[PDB]
Write a protein that binds this ligand. Structure first.
Ligand SMILES: [Mn+2]
Ligand SMILES: [Mn+2]
Ligand SMILES: [Zn+2]
Lengths: 72, 796, 93, 113, 50
């Protein structure tokens, strides 16, 4: 579970970097901090909260289609 | 009882409070610098012939002033009284009071030194050089009794650390003026001894922290005006404290007083040769070794190191804008150019290029490469940079906007991870869990990691100790062979690697190893033997998997520096990485039983073996420039025939101007590298290896010297310690016999396995328990006083 | 080369340290500021003094390389700006 | 207890002069040191007022080194033979510790006021 | 994950965050509710479930 959430944080920051999030210095710095703290986290509660915070960045943009990517 | 107190209070300061038990002595654990025909070294002893009476201020307030009255034999009493009467007129002498006081049935002579501090200069030097956070009470008392800090400062954890809480530098700097006053009083005392015809050896334990001198029980009298104060051990042991406390901080003032504005040196002024000589005469007047402010004039590499140690101290006074490349306007095709025709090193002094063309017709390839690698043109053609993110001296901004480089997150391997979790991996509570990741970094990460060079401080090394550690390290680097190799004999792995700045704009190292013929490369390499080529080192963010979120940075050294350093060092480096069973295990494979061979060679002949590895915190960032220069000189010890003394010195100057104090190109702008290892140079691993061996040898030397030689049961180790002190602070030339003996002793009892700052030592445990070998605390103390870091024992 | 020759010809032998050429003869100064607390100390107002010279700001940008006006550098408006602020100034006379 | 120099040494008999081979047969009191790397002369002591160069051969015989001397030091020593007014000379570049050893030996083997 | 699933479903159908959602109990959150269905499903009185 903890390894799962860390790997999801890795892939989420990968897709954020692919979406030119690094063009926003504040947003990219916050994303980097969240991603590095998830990987350094020891419990699956703080890590999951930071994962929600990081995913909010992806959900905050219109560059990714959320309905299409949810094929289940 | 009360009569003895009144006798001590002779004609001044009647308000004394007995620290002992009346007319009895006061046993203290002080640090001395003894050398008397049986026992030698610099260790903490137990003084048992000393009565201390601390003066009190008005209204019964204790003050830092003690009347240290000691009883001694009649002959020593009268001898000390006579020599003091010869030296009493000197202001830098403790007020001695001589009297015979009847104790039981005889008038036992007494000597009352007046207005002494609780701890001597040796106590401060020992506390700063043999530091131990587990028990450092003398250092705390010294810091609190001189308003350096409060007792509440020590309640803060890591108050002593340099990487954590850099304010300890400011705390130690408050001892700087006191140490400088002690230096001035030492110079005055040496002048008094010379004029009065008193011959003796100055030691830190004979000078209190105010600066006044005492203990004349070992001085001898000669004809007045011909006296000689033997001060090598004193100054040598004080040298690490001088830069740690920044003792010469007052010299950057109008009247050398800490109440005036900083002396506004001429911006164009870079020489400072006269200022360095004036500083040396003011603080090291009787240092009986010729000091060359410019290291071009030094005799050999040992003299280069000796004078660079003084230059380190003296460069803390001069403005940082006066160091770096020395540039002048030259004309090519009649068009003016701004190129570096010299360099002003903080350690090597002023160095001028010998093949300098103020006018030229055209430059074909070699001068074009030199001027392209030269930071002179880029800095002159760039915008002035004031980067407040870092304390490092910014130079210029080459582009109109700052480049913020980020580190991408790692690319996931979902297939492998799913296969692993399919095989029962990464279970909740499994002993194996993912701890290594490609940690991402934001825009202001390259500059943030470059600011870690703030941990590189100007460090003055114990020169009489460093000159022996260098000989021991050279004995370590003896089985190898090295020297100059031609351009056709140079092996370059991965020619498609980046070539520094600005050569990365046009191609990799393959272009510059293909565009330059063997004669072109040989001409460029011979140019560096009589010229200095400052180079731009590009700071590159490392994109690799690690267990630490801190950004990793590697130094991209220019092809001009790397190509010449290859021709200068690669023979020795290949010899080092071709030797098996040696202390340095670079080039020794861990495969095919090579790891077993390495470990068996580590367990060579240790009688009571333990394994001990340590850590250098911020090794490439906090390594003193003196130790990097020592590393380059040890690597240059193989050039006895291929290079002249001028050639070796100019190669060292190129090393210092390219990989030690070069212009770093972090982001898109130039900065000044204060020092440390530019861990991207052609000798990174091997220079770090010789640095590691030097640190280990220094720790062993400090363990031997900071050991009670009376309590050393073995008669061979005791004599080894005595001769170690002799070869450090008494012998001036290399004692190759004792250098070999100490090298063999280290190999037998402190066998090492050295890579680039990673080391494993199989040490004699029963010797390190007895202080005959550095266990871990000597390493911690050596890092504290000679690396400007606190080596945490949890990393060892 | 005007100020460059002014400082080169003023040298003892035409040789000067490199660290002073941008500090004396550079027509443009770039200041990188990590926070507003360092901004108010260094680059206060539309003109400021540094390196024994007077510099007048012509452009301020953030790490995003977006032009940010001087009115936006406020105590309350600081968290709304990317913060390595890069202020570029010109030499005054 | 930092002693100056325990178990010091004595002086040898050698020839010296004021310029190169100005030594007729013998005029000096050379102070030697039996260093492990070879015999080392430390100081000169002559009745003549001024000396500049001395010729003390090494143990090899073929190699004779001409030693440059420091400006003379003048003093009076009270010996059992009455006043012995010698002039002290130090070889240029001598260490301060060697000077201390030489002075200690001179003051221990010769009576002083 | 319940929180991740909630925010993902909201972004799929209804409200998306207008900024990084905080985890401290002092900072604020801005969302974009596009119709009454998500407004009723998420908001109830003075409380907003997200
Ligand atoms: Mn003493
Ligand atoms: Mn004594
Ligand atoms: Zn060579």
């Amino acid at each position: 579970k903890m390894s799962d959430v860390k790997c999801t944080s890795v892939v989420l920051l990968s897709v954020l970097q692919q979406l030119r999030v690094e063009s926003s210095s504040k947003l990219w710095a916050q994303c980097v901090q969240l991603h590095n703290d998830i990987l350094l986290a020891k419990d699956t509660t703080e890590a999951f909260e930071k994962m929600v915070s990081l995913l909010s960045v992806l959900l905050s943009m219109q560059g990714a289609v959320d309905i299409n990517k949810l094929c289940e | 009882a009360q009569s003895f107190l009144n006798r001590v209070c002779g004609v001044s300061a009647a308000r004394l409070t007995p620290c002992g038990t009346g007319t009895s002595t006061d046993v203290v654990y002080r640090a001395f610098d003894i050398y008397n025909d049986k026992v030698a070294g610099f260790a903490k002893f137990l003084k048992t012939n000393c009565c201390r009476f601390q003066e009190k201020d008005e209204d019964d307030n204790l003050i830092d002033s003690y009347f240290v009255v000691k009883r001694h034999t009649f002959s020593n009493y009268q001898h000390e009284e006579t020599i003091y009467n010869l030296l009493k007129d000197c202001p830098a002498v403790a007020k001695h009071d001589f009297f015979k006081f009847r104790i039981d049935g005889d008038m036992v002579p007494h000597i009352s030194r007046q207005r002494l501090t609780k701890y001597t200069m040796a106590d401060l030097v020992y506390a700063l050089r043999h530091f131990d956070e587990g028990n450092c009470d003398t250092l705390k008392e010294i810091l609190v009794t001189y308003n350096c800090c409060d007792d509440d400062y020590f309640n803060k954890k890591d108050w002593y650390d340099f990487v954590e809480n850099p304010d300890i530098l400011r705390v130690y700097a408050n001892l700087g003026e006191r140490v400088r006053q002690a230096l001035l009083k030492t110079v005055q005392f040496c002048d008094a001894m010379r004029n009065a015809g008193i011959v003796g050896v100055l030691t830190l334990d004979n000078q209190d922290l105010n600066g006044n001198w005492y203990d004349f029980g070992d001085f001898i009298q000669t004809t007045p005006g011909s006296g000689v104060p033997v001060v090598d051990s004193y100054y040598s042991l004080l040298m690490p404290i001088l830069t740690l406390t920044r003792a010469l901080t007052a010299e950057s003032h109008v009247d050398t007083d800490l109440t005036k504005p900083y002396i506004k040196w001429d911006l164009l002024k870079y020489d400072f040769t006269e200022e360095r000589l004036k500083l040396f005469d003011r603080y090291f007047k009787y240092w009986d070794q010729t000091y060359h402010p410019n290291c071009v004039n030094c005799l050999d590499d040992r003299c280069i190191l000796h004078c660079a140690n003084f230059n380190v101290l003296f460069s803390t006074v001069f403005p940082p804008t006066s160091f770096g490349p020395l540039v002048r306007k030259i004309f090519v095709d009649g068009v003016p150019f701004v190129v570096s025709t010299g360099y002003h090193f903080r350690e090597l002094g002023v160095v001028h290029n010998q093949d300098v063309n103020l006018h030229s017709s055209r430059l074909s390839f070699k001068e074009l490469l030199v001027y392209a690698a030269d930071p002179a043109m880029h800095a002159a053609s760039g915008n002035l940079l004031l980067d407040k993110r870092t304390t490092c001296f910014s130079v210029a901004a080459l582009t109109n906007n700052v480049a913020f480089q980020t580190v991408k997150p790692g690319n996931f391997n979902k297939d492998f991870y799913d296969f692993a979790v399919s095989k029962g991996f990464f279970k909740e509570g499994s002993s194996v869990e993912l701890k290594h990741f490609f940690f991402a970094q934001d825009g202001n990460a390259a500059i943030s990691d470059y600011d870690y060079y703030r941990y590189n401080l100007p460090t003055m090394c114990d020169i009489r100790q460093l000159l022996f550690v260098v000989e021991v390290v050279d004995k370590y680097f003896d089985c190898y062979d090295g020297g100059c190799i031609n351009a056709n004999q140079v092996i370059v792995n991965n020619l498609d690697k980046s070539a520094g700045f600005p050569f990365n704009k046009w191609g990799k190292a393959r272009l510059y190893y293909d565009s330059m013929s063997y004669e072109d490369q040989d001409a460029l390499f011979a140019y560096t033997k009589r010229n200095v080529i400052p180079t731009i080192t590009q700071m590159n963010l490392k994109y690799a998997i690690s267990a630490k979120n801190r950004a990793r940075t590697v130094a991209g050294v220019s092809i001009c520096s790397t190509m010449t350093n290859r021709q200068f060092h690669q023979k020795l480096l290949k010899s080092i990485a071709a030797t098996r069973g040696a202390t340095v295990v670079i080039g020794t494979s861990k495969f095919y039983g090579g790891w077993h061979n390495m470990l068996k060679t580590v367990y060579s002949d240790v009688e009571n073996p333990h394994l001990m590895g340590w850590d250098y915190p911020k090794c490439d960032r906090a390594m003193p420039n003196m130790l990097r220069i020592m590393a380059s000189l040890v690597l240059a010890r193989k050039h006895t025939t291929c290079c002249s003394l001028s050639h070796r010195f100019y190669r060292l100057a190129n090393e210092c101007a390219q990989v030690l104090s070069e212009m770093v190109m972090c982001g898109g702008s130039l900065y000044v590298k204060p020092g440390g290892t530019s861990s991207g140079d052609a000798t990174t691993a091997y220079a770090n290896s010789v640095f590691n061996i030097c640190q280990a040898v220094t720790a062993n030397v400090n363990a031997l010297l900071s050991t009670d030689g009376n309590k050393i049961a073995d008669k061979y180790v005791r004599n080894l310690q005595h001769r170690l002190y002799e070869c450090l602070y008494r012998n001036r030339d290399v004692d190759t016999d004792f250098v070999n003996e100490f090298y063999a002793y280290l190999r037998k009892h402190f066998s090492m396995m050295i890579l680039s700052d990673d080391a494993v030592v199989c040490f004699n445990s029963t010797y390190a328990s007895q202080g005959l070998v550095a266990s871990i605390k000597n390493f911690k103390s050596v890092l504290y006083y000679q690396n400007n870091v606190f080596m945490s024992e949890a990393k060892c | 080369n005007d100020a460059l020759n002014n400082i080169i010809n003023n040298a003892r032998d035409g040789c000067v340290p490199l660290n002073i050429i941008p500090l004396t003869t550079a027509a443009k100064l770039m200041v990188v500021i990590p926070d507003y607390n360092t901004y108010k100390n260094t680059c206060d107002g539309t003109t400021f003094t540094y390196a024994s010279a007077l510099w007048e700001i012509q452009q301020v940008v953030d790490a995003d390389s977006k032009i940010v006006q001087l009115s936006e550098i406020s105590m309350d408006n600081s968290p709304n700006l990317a913060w390595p602020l890069i202020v570029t100034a010109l030499r005054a006379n | 207890n930092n002693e100056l120099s325990p178990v010091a040494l004595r002086q040898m008999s050698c020839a010296a002069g004021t310029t190169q081979t100005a030594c007729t047969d013998d005029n000096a009191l050379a102070y030697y040191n039996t260093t492990k790397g070879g015999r080392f002369v430390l100081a000169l002591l002559s009745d003549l007022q001024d000396l500049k160069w001395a010729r003390f051969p090494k143990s090899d015989g073929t190699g004779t080194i001409y030693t440059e001397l420091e400006p003379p030091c003048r003093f009076v020593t009270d010996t059992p033979k009455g006043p012995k007014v010698k002039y002290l000379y130090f070889i240029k570049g001598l260490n301060n510790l060697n000077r201390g050893m030489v002075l200690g030996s001179l003051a221990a083997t010769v009576r002083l006021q």
